[PDB]
Design an enzyme around this catalytic site. Sequence first.
Site, PDB file in Angstrom:
ATOM      1  N   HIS A 254      48.604  34.694  44.234  1.00 26.35           N
ATOM      2  CA  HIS A 254      48.898  34.721  42.809  1.00 26.35           C
ATOM      3  C   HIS A 254      49.096  36.140  42.292  1.00 26.35           C
ATOM      4  CE1 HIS A 254      46.682  30.612  42.700  1.00 26.35           C
ATOM      5  NE2 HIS A 254      47.950  30.474  43.041  1.00 26.35           N
TER       6      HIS A 254
ATOM      7  N   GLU B 265      29.667  24.061  45.660  1.00 29.31           N
ATOM      8  CA  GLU B 265      29.801  22.616  45.768  1.00 29.31           C
ATOM      9  C   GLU B 265      30.837  22.283  46.833  1.00 29.31           C
ATOM     10  OE1 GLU B 265      30.937  24.085  42.932  1.00 29.31           O
ATOM     11  OE2 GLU B 265      29.125  24.166  41.681  1.00 29.31           O
TER      12      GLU B 265
ATOM     13  N   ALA C 180      38.023  32.194  43.039  1.00 26.68           N
ATOM     14  CA  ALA C 180      37.293  32.902  41.994  1.00 26.68           C
ATOM     15  C   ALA C 180      35.805  32.976  42.296  1.00 26.68           C
ATOM     16  CB  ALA C 180      37.523  32.233  40.641  1.00 26.68           C
TER      17      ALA C 180
ATOM     18  N   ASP D 202      35.617  33.179  35.773  1.00 22.63           N
ATOM     19  CA  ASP D 202      36.884  32.483  35.915  1.00 22.63           C
ATOM     20  C   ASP D 202      37.812  32.808  34.750  1.00 22.63           C
ATOM     21  OD1 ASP D 202      35.077  31.313  37.800  1.00 22.63           O
ATOM     22  OD2 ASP D 202      36.440  29.597  37.987  1.00 22.63           O
ATOM     23  N   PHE D 203      38.674  33.818  34.931  1.00 22.47           N
ATOM     24  CA  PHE D 203      39.495  34.318  33.830  1.00 22.47           C
ATOM     25  C   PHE D 203      40.454  33.258  33.307  1.00 22.47           C
ATOM     26  CE2 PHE D 203      44.046  35.139  34.259  1.00 22.47           C
ATOM     27  CZ  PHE D 203      44.303  34.893  35.593  1.00 22.47           C
TER      28      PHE D 203
ATOM     29  N   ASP E  16      41.912  40.213  41.006  1.00 23.11           N
ATOM     30  CA  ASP E  16      40.968  41.212  40.511  1.00 23.11           C
ATOM     31  C   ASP E  16      40.877  42.464  41.373  1.00 23.11           C
ATOM     32  OD1 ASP E  16      39.377  40.503  42.752  1.00 23.11           O
ATOM     33  OD2 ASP E  16      38.282  39.005  41.590  1.00 23.11           O
TER      34      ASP E  16
ATOM     35  N   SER F 119      33.910  36.240  43.375  1.00 15.91           N
ATOM     36  CA  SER F 119      33.867  37.373  42.465  1.00 15.91           C
ATOM     37  C   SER F 119      33.000  37.144  41.234  1.00 15.91           C
ATOM     38  CB  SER F 119      35.286  37.759  42.017  1.00 15.91           C
ATOM     39  OG  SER F 119      36.073  38.165  43.121  1.00 15.91           O
ATOM     40  N   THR F 120      32.438  35.947  41.054  1.00 13.15           N
ATOM     41  CA  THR F 120      31.575  35.722  39.899  1.00 13.15           C
ATOM     42  C   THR F 120      30.303  36.558  39.973  1.00 13.15           C
ATOM     43  OG1 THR F 120      30.763  33.762  41.049  1.00 13.15           O
ATOM     44  CG2 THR F 120      32.441  33.452  39.352  1.00 13.15           C
TER      45      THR F 120
ATOM     46  N   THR G 136      36.333  28.586  46.360  1.00 13.81           N
ATOM     47  CA  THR G 136      37.471  27.913  45.746  1.00 13.81           C
ATOM     48  C   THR G 136      37.260  26.409  45.805  1.00 13.81           C
ATOM     49  OG1 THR G 136      39.854  27.477  45.882  1.00 13.81           O
ATOM     50  CG2 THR G 136      38.715  28.063  47.910  1.00 13.81           C
ATOM     51  N   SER G 137      37.678  25.724  44.740  1.00 12.59           N
ATOM     52  CA  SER G 137      37.575  24.273  44.665  1.00 12.59           C
ATOM     53  C   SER G 137      38.723  23.562  45.370  1.00 12.59           C
ATOM     54  CB  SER G 137      37.512  23.825  43.199  1.00 12.59           C
ATOM     55  OG  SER G 137      38.734  24.091  42.531  1.00 12.59           O
TER      56      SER G 137
HETATM   57  N1  LIG Z   1      39.075  36.310  39.428  1.00 15.05           N
HETATM   58  C1  LIG Z   1      40.279  35.749  39.465  1.00 15.05           C
HETATM   59  O1  LIG Z   1      41.274  36.333  39.908  1.00 15.05           O
HETATM   60  C2  LIG Z   1      40.421  34.361  38.906  1.00 15.05           C
HETATM   61  C3  LIG Z   1      39.405  33.839  38.118  1.00 15.05           C
HETATM   62  C4  LIG Z   1      39.530  32.570  37.582  1.00 15.05           C
HETATM   63  C5  LIG Z   1      40.659  31.839  37.831  1.00 15.05           C
HETATM   64  N2  LIG Z   1      41.637  32.357  38.597  1.00 15.05           N
HETATM   65  C6  LIG Z   1      42.815  31.478  38.844  1.00 15.05           C
HETATM   66  O2  LIG Z   1      42.356  30.229  39.284  1.00 15.05           O
HETATM   67  C7  LIG Z   1      43.258  29.697  40.280  1.00 15.05           C
HETATM   68  C8  LIG Z   1      42.527  29.501  41.584  1.00 15.05           C
HETATM   69  O3  LIG Z   1      41.442  28.563  41.429  1.00 15.05           O
HETATM   70  P1  LIG Z   1      40.153  28.758  42.349  1.00 15.05           P
HETATM   71  O4  LIG Z   1      40.125  27.703  43.391  1.00 15.05           O
HETATM   72  O5  LIG Z   1      40.108  30.177  42.757  1.00 15.05           O
HETATM   73  O6  LIG Z   1      38.982  28.497  41.294  1.00 15.05           O
HETATM   74  P2  LIG Z   1      38.160  27.175  40.937  1.00 15.05           P
HETATM   75  O7  LIG Z   1      37.408  27.393  39.682  1.00 15.05           O
HETATM   76  O8  LIG Z   1      39.074  26.014  41.050  1.00 15.05           O
HETATM   77  O9  LIG Z   1      37.122  27.138  42.146  1.00 15.05           O
HETATM   78  C9  LIG Z   1      36.111  28.157  42.286  1.00 15.05           C
HETATM   79  C10 LIG Z   1      34.969  27.550  43.060  1.00 15.05           C
HETATM   80  O10 LIG Z   1      33.989  28.568  43.372  1.00 15.05           O
HETATM   81  C11 LIG Z   1      32.705  28.065  43.072  1.00 15.05           C
HETATM   82  N3  LIG Z   1      31.820  29.191  42.797  1.00 15.05           N
HETATM   83  C12 LIG Z   1      31.755  29.952  41.660  1.00 15.05           C
HETATM   84  N4  LIG Z   1      30.902  30.945  41.728  1.00 15.05           N
HETATM   85  C13 LIG Z   1      30.364  30.829  43.002  1.00 15.05           C
HETATM   86  C14 LIG Z   1      29.414  31.593  43.706  1.00 15.05           C
HETATM   87  N5  LIG Z   1      28.807  32.676  43.208  1.00 15.05           N
HETATM   88  N6  LIG Z   1      29.118  31.217  44.970  1.00 15.05           N
HETATM   89  C15 LIG Z   1      29.736  30.151  45.485  1.00 15.05           C
HETATM   90  N7  LIG Z   1      30.647  29.356  44.917  1.00 15.05           N
HETATM   91  C16 LIG Z   1      30.921  29.751  43.670  1.00 15.05           C
HETATM   92  C17 LIG Z   1      32.913  27.102  41.912  1.00 15.05           C
HETATM   93  O11 LIG Z   1      31.841  26.167  41.833  1.00 15.05           O
HETATM   94  C18 LIG Z   1      34.218  26.425  42.342  1.00 15.05           C
HETATM   95  O12 LIG Z   1      33.982  25.337  43.230  1.00 15.05           O
HETATM   96  C19 LIG Z   1      44.418  30.689  40.350  1.00 15.05           C
HETATM   97  O13 LIG Z   1      45.469  30.318  39.464  1.00 15.05           O
HETATM   98  C20 LIG Z   1      43.759  32.003  39.929  1.00 15.05           C
HETATM   99  O14 LIG Z   1      44.694  32.921  39.373  1.00 15.05           O
HETATM  100  C21 LIG Z   1      41.543  33.586  39.131  1.00 15.05           C
HETATM  101  C1  LIG Z   2      42.441  42.671  32.525  1.00 19.75           C
HETATM  102  N1  LIG Z   2      42.878  41.341  32.927  1.00 19.75           N
HETATM  103  N2  LIG Z   2      43.687  40.634  32.088  1.00 19.75           N
HETATM  104  C2  LIG Z   2      43.902  39.490  32.722  1.00 19.75           C
HETATM  105  C3  LIG Z   2      44.765  38.457  32.084  1.00 19.75           C
HETATM  106  F1  LIG Z   2      45.121  38.794  30.853  1.00 19.75           F
HETATM  107  F2  LIG Z   2      45.885  38.249  32.765  1.00 19.75           F
HETATM  108  F3  LIG Z   2      44.158  37.283  31.990  1.00 19.75           F
HETATM  109  C4  LIG Z   2      43.250  39.441  33.956  1.00 19.75           C
HETATM  110  C5  LIG Z   2      42.595  40.650  34.064  1.00 19.75           C
HETATM  111  C6  LIG Z   2      41.754  41.157  35.171  1.00 19.75           C
HETATM  112  C7  LIG Z   2      42.061  42.405  35.720  1.00 19.75           C
HETATM  113  C8  LIG Z   2      41.281  42.937  36.731  1.00 19.75           C
HETATM  114  C9  LIG Z   2      40.196  42.239  37.208  1.00 19.75           C
HETATM  115  C10 LIG Z   2      39.886  40.996  36.687  1.00 19.75           C
HETATM  116  C11 LIG Z   2      40.655  40.432  35.672  1.00 19.75           C
HETATM  117  C12 LIG Z   2      40.309  39.052  35.173  1.00 19.75           C
HETATM  118  O1  LIG Z   2      39.071  39.026  34.483  1.00 19.75           O
END
Ligand SMILES: NC(=O)c1ccc[n+]([C@@H]2O[C@H](COP(=O)([O-])OP(=O)(O)OC[C@H]3O[C@@H](n4cnc5c(N)ncnc54)[C@H](O)[C@@H]3O)[C@@H](O)[C@H]2O)c1
Ligand SMILES: Cn1nc(C(F)(F)F)cc1-c1ccccc1CO
Length: 282
Positions: free
Chosen positions: A121, A222, A30, A40-41, A104, A33-34, A196-197
């Site tokens: 995922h 981190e 995640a 973090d959805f 995403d 993409s922040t 990713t953590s």
């Molecule tokens: N965008 C998404 O698709 C999304 C978002 C949130 C969670 N998830 C779900 O979370 C799970 C995966 O966990 P994960 O390991 O991806 O997330 P996580 O939160 O466990 O780890 C994300 C890491 O990225 C770091 N981080 C955040 N923003 C940053 C930036 N700008 N630059 C550098 N580092 C940054 C955080 O400090 C953290 O260490 C899956 O189940 C996934 O579906 C997906």
């Molecule tokens: C619209 N939607 N909905 C979800 C859920 F409901 F599954 F969580 C996740 C998303 C999505 C879709 C495209 C890009 C990024 C995201 C996550 O912010």
Amino acid sequence: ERLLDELTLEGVARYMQSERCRRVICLVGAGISTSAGIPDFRKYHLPYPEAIFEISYFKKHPEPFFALAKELYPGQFKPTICHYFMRLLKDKGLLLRCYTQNIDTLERIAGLEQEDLVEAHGTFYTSHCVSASCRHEYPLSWMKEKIFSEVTPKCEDCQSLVKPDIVFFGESLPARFFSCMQSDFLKVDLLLVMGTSLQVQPFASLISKAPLSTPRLLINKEKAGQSDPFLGGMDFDSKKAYRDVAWLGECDQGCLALAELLGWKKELEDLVRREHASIDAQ
Ligand SMILES: NC(=O)c1ccc[n+]([C@@H]2O[C@H](COP(=O)([O-])OP(=O)(O)OC[C@H]3O[C@@H](n4cnc5c(N)ncnc54)[C@H](O)[C@@H]3O)[C@@H](O)[C@H]2O)c1
Ligand SMILES: Cn1nc(C(F)(F)F)cc1-c1ccccc1CO
Ligand SMILES: [Zn+2]
């Protein structure tokens, strides 16, 4: 002894441009993409809060999921500098595969093709009718129109529910993950772990599937992936450290620094600016 001459980003860049490094696997989460606006959805009377992401409840009551989807839907799908650095890796002939935990779609918008990607995922990019005898596929445009109009998505062929191709709770991981893992990690020269953590299994254990000599670079806010003192982990700092490097900061800035070391900074800047310009112009 080691493939890296020093446990720095500079050593990684030198290794990357050596003839030893031909195949790079990216493991992203995640964090990449922040900076794109996607955080973090992860009334409906859910039996348990996880039900909104469990497959059985969804097939029984999908409306909560799609309400949450309208609330979380991004205002723009603009990939980050990190995404386009992976696209550049593809262009330079160095990308074996990108394994992503994100749903995403930003990897595909940045120009990575399905063959380049293991979406561990799933993804919102494609959706499918839930009926096994049908499996009609629908694009993200169709699904967005359904979500925004607050009409539950139904198949045009058989009127069954249509679900985005994300892996819900109670669904299995895509088999492509395991097959690609068994082949790719016999071939990897460098593991690039970004945003990713490394706490969610089995995606985390991927780092232990690399050969012992394969360097592993973490670009993350981190440190992560080290063995948990309580319960093939990352070793960045011990006296026995030999292959693991941590660049702590924003994924965009880490990819920028790596590109600068590689001589790609102008290519990356031009790619990002033209792709962002085309996205803004839609
Ligand atoms: N965008 C998404 O698709 C999304 C978002 C949130 C969670 N998830 C779900 O979370 C799970 C995966 O966990 P994960 O390991 O991806 O997330 P996580 O939160 O466990 O780890 C994300 C890491 O990225 C770091 N981080 C955040 N923003 C940053 C930036 N700008 N630059 C550098 N580092 C940054 C955080 O400090 C953290 O260490 C899956 O189940 C996934 O579906 C997906
Ligand atoms: C619209 N939607 N909905 C979800 C859920 F409901 F599954 F969580 C996740 C998303 C999505 C879709 C495209 C890009 C990024 C995201 C996550 O912010
Ligand atoms: Zn159907």
